[PDB]
Design a binder for this molecule. Structure first.
Ligand SMILES: CO[C@H]1[C@H](O)[C@@H](O)[C@@H](O[C@H]2[C@H](O[C@@H]3CO[C@@H](O)[C@H](O)[C@H]3O)OC[C@@H](O)[C@@H]2O)O[C@@H]1C(=O)O
Ligand SMILES: CO[C@H]1[C@H](O)[C@@H](O)[C@@H](O[C@H]2[C@H](O[C@@H]3CO[C@@H](O)[C@H](O)[C@H]3O)OC[C@@H](O)[C@@H]2O)O[C@@H]1C(=O)O
Ligand SMILES: O[C@@H]1[C@@H](O)[C@H](O[C@@H]2CO[C@@H](O)[C@H](O)[C@H]2O)OC[C@H]1O
Ligand SMILES: O[C@@H]1[C@@H](O)[C@H](O)OC[C@H]1O
Ligand SMILES: O[C@@H]1[C@@H](O)[C@H](O)OC[C@H]1O
Lengths: 436, 436
């Protein structure tokens, strides 16, 4: 099983990327993670219209190239984002309309693709052209007002500018098949393919949250578009709350569709997110892997034939054959957990939540009061602290998100009453566990 | 009164205070909450040694008086903090020792107490004089080196400077009766009382976290000290994670002790906390009441007529007589909840967690999309966002922490299938629920 997202994705011929912010590239903590985990890069803002053509006819690639250079220097491909869009247009363009805007759109496409010709894997040629008003129609923007054919023109222009790049139409809220927006976009791509309009891919931003939740029918959405003869890509993935199950579900949806090229999460750490408040990424503020990271990696690596327990379950240490136990079924915060003869008792029933917590009694969380070796692993009222979140590695180890240390049975102990602590991860049987 | 903390505590002859930071008195959002909820104020830094006597013999009461005046003008008494302490001493004092330091200590007490003579309800005369080494002995500091009798001298000095003030010894990690530090303090206070040393109160900072968790024996500690003939006060309360149950437990511990004068939480909003990372207070950064706030208020008002349910229970609407139900027991994120004939089924069993979530199925959370009226109330993977946290008002209403809006049966509906939304609280029967 591969150890990093990009490499794991590559095991199925796919890529796993992120959105890079040029201004954060001087931050070693940021780049260490980004360079290690992803093999695909999208400039978060540096290749947008305002950044690449600040004044009409004056193309500026300094910012975009800072991102591009970093990507290629570190073995990553690049997704160009984005050429035609109603948002983040430079002031001079916002003042345009009609034929003048139409030609500016065409000139912009030519200038940017010309500069990056032969260097970009995919280009989000047109972004967010459909409305969220429920009509399944076009967004009313200066671009749409130039004529309904603006999108088609953008793609034809792009094909000529760089016939080597995959041309994508990118949008959000087009993941749930039942949504009018999703179907409106489907009809457009269908029409394009039927009439010969150059389009090779559809990018699903995949910004999931309680307002626009992930739905299992996303797989049918991807299949529907793939059947039109275009590749599909998850371009700006982030999930409010970073549910491990939802992240794995989205990953498995892509792995289920042969035409799904790969997945790009919109950012590196939650603190780098445009929606940091939703802690929707795979790494938290201090750059540590979250429970969701492990779920995605597991999925990319093929997962397992035996689905993980749900609604509870024991945690038995392979070394002692004993289960994680809360002394005397106590509910006192600060109570250090131990290894004890497995038996049907709530004080041995642990639930691995999508947030990455290990709950017992329903409201008590496996908790670590410290980050160094020998830290006592105990129970404490659940509140979501990083010292209450864990990653269940495929090798059977259980690592604390905040500490990066493995649950360890003191002195390799195996007898009952053996205390559980944190300690540098090894491979010892006193650090491996089985979910029953 | 019973709608605010101070007023609710006053019903039992107690107070509920906070630590005030003079630098935030210009913040209306800050003062709106502070002036409304508390009837006791402790200067967070303005009455410390360094602040009141910048240079030997040269007293400055500008900052202290600003906090004192604000408190009194807004109907709050004041706890003086603090007269003798090893930490944060001014440069001129840190360089003193022996008899000279002893004299400085005595001079400082006379100057500060003389200035506030008869205006201070309680004074933390001596602060944190015991060690955390586990020996139960005195902390090794410049003060302790002047002679073991410095504490007694401090109290005798204080009593003379102002006999109208209650003189307290304040410390942290003295809440758990089994801890050696607690015993050391206990033995000293007992000795003082037997020898007539003028000590009227013992302040328990009450800083609870996974490293030094709340334990039910805290009530025993308070009761044991009270039995010595000294009042007790919870002086700097904050709880890592702000568990509703722990905050209510601490509140009830004070209400259970006749000598417990009141409770002071160490700050107004989590963003104002010296430990904001532990989100240990009763209000959020945006100033919204947290789940713990309601728990504390409810406790101060005399709890309920019957001990509230614990883990897994139905939530029945008063006006409809029907239960909060997840349509067809769906587990799909985004499923809007409804009212339905009550029956024993998991899709009707809700667990109110200490963090304020309302869980179903074990890892699904009552979730509000937006924050305005009409917002759909649904289920979504649990992650702890404020839109997944709720307050159980004694009046039977359920309010969302983020929105400040009440769970509402659409259009006062009462039939099966009536959808649930958020809406300005109205005390209506379509917004009232009972847990059975
Ligand atoms: C096989 O019996 C089950 C029924 O097929 C199943 O529909 C359910 O029926 C319950 C009924 O369920 C509610 C139906 O409306 C939904 O909107 C609501 O969310 C459901 O909770 O509630 C009344 C109860 O008497 C019915 O039996 O469950 C049946 C079962 O066997 O549990
Ligand atoms: C006679 O006053 C009534 C108002 O005219 C009426 O609008 C309503 O106002 C309530 C408000 O009602 C909600 C309206 O939307 C529904 O979907 C929801 O279920 C209702 O609860 O709720 C907030 C409350 O502050 C307003 O006063 O009811 C008023 C009344 O007193 O009956
Ligand atoms: O104020 C502007 C921001 O709102 C803008 O935000 C970007 C919007 O597009 C998203 O894809 C990006 O992640 C997000 O940063 O950035 C430019 C800034 O001036
Ligand atoms: O917690 C342990 C319990 O699970 C076992 O049944 O009896 C011994 C206890 O210490
Ligand atoms: O159990 C621990 C063991 O795994 C580690 O290797 O050495 C220290 C022990 O306490």
């Amino acid at each position: 099983a591969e150890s990093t997202l990009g490499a794991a994705a590559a095991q199925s011929g796919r890529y796993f990327g992120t959105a890079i912010a040029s201004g954060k590239l001087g931050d070693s903590a940021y780049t260490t993670i980004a360079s290690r985990e992803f093999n695909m890069v999208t400039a978060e803002n540096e290749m947008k219209i305002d950044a690449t053509e600040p004044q009409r006819g004056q193309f500026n690639f300094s910012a975009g190239d800072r991102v591009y250079n970093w990507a290629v220097q570190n073995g990553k491909q690049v997704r160009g984002h984005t050429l035609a869009w109603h948002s983040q247009q430079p002031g001079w363009m916002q003042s345009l309309s009609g034929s003048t805007l139409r030609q500016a759109m065409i000139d912009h496409i030519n200038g940017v693709m010309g500069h990056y010709k032969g260097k970009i894997a995919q280009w989000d040629v047109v972004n967010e052209a459909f409305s969220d008003d429920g009509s399944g129609g076009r967004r009313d923007s200066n671009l749409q007002r130039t004529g309904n054919d603006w999108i088609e023109v953008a793609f034809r222009t792009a094909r000529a500018a760089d016939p080597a790049a995959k041309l994508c139409y990118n949008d959000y809220n087009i993941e749930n098949w039942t949504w009018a927006k999703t179907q409106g976009v489907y009809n457009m791509v269908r029409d394009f393919k039927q009439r010969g309009v150059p389009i090779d891919c559809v990018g699903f931003q995949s910004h999931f949250n309680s307002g626009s939740p992930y739905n299992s029918n996303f797989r049918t959405t991807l299949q529907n578009f793939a059947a039109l003869g275009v590749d599909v890509a998850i371009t700006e993935l982030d999930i409010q709350g970073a549910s491990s199950s939802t992240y794995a579900a989205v990953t498995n949806d892509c792995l289920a569709v042969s035409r799904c090229l790969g997945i790009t999460v919109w950012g590196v750490r939650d603190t780098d997110s445009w929606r940091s408040g939703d802690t929707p990424l795979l790494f938290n503020g201090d750059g540590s892997k979250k429970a969701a990271y492990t779920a995605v990696l597991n999925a990319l690596n093929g997962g397992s034939s035996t689905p993980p327990p749900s609604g509870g379950g024991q945690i038995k240490g392979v070394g002692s054959g004993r289960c994680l136990d809360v002394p005397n079924a106590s509910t006192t915060d600060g109570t250090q957990v131990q290894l004890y003869d497995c038996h049907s008792a709530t004080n041995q029933q642990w639930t691995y939540t999508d947030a990455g917590e290990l709950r017992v009694y329903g409201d008590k969380c496996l908790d670590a009061a410290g980050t160094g070796n020998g830290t006592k692993v105990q129970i404490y009222s659940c509140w979501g602290g990083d010292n209450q979140k864990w990653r269940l590695n495929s090798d059977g180890s259980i690592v604390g998100v905040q500490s990066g240390l493995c649950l360890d049975a003191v002195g390799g102990g195996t007898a009952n009453g053996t205390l559980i602590q944190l300690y540098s991860c090894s491979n010892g049987s006193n650090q491996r566990w089985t979910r029953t």
